[PDB]
Amino acid sequence: MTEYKLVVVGAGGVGKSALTIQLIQNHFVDEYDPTIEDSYRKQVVIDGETCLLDILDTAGQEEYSAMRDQYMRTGEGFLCVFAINNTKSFEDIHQYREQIKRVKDSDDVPMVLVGNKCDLAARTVESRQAQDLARSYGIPYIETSAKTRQGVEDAFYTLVREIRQH
Ligand SMILES: Nc1nc2c(ncn2[C@@H]2O[C@H](COP(=O)(O)OP(=O)(O)O)[C@@H](O)[C@H]2O)c(=O)[nH]1
Numbered sequence: 001m002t003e004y005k006l007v008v009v010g011a012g013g014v015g016k017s018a019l020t021i022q023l024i025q026n027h028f029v030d031e032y033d034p035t036i037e038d039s040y041r042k043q044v045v046i047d048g049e050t051c052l053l054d055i056l057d058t059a060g061q062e063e064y065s066a067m068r069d070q071y072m073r074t075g076e077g078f079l080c081v082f083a084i085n086n087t088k089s090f091e092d093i094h095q096y097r098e099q100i101k102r103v104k105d106s107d108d109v110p111m112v113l114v115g116n117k118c119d120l121a122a123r124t125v126e127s128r129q130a131q132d133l134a135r136s137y138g139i140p141y142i143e144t145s146a147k148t149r150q151g152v153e154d155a156f157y158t159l160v161r162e163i164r165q166h
């Protein structure tokens, strides 16, 4: 069976939780955890052996840090969400990919720069400049929008595909 932890991170307001719960319960949630810090679990068979997928999401309440540090050292998959409408998510990926290298103390994670919220808000982040951002780190690039379940499949699936082959 084996199990994997989807260490998700990427700005606050990109749609990272509504995206996770979507693949699980399947339902566009406007806010199913505006301040909750619980781990989501959903087991399925991704053409393997029923690999349990324990997704991990953040919240933002308080600001002392503690489990986040031990989350980069425990989990391994990095779904770096980034909304392509506000742009602050892109600048947030340029720093969240340094602390992960801090914890593991290495530059070779199964990172995954996924752009969410591409179903609206004029494309502020085209796929060209974004293609050169992830291409430099050797990480896969994808698009996503839980508002219509578009791209959500290529994100989660490609995530377990990078951790497995690794
Ligand atoms: N258009 C669109 N907006 C989204 C999507 N996911 C999240 N959002 C926005 O983020 C809010 C949903 O709350 P939440 O799931 O907590 O967002 P997160 O905390 O940033 O992941 C909504 O008000 C949406 O405007 C998505 O797939 N499409």
Ligand SMILES: [Mg+2]
Binding pocket: 012, 013, 015, 016, 017, 018, 057, 058
């Ligand atoms: Mg969230």
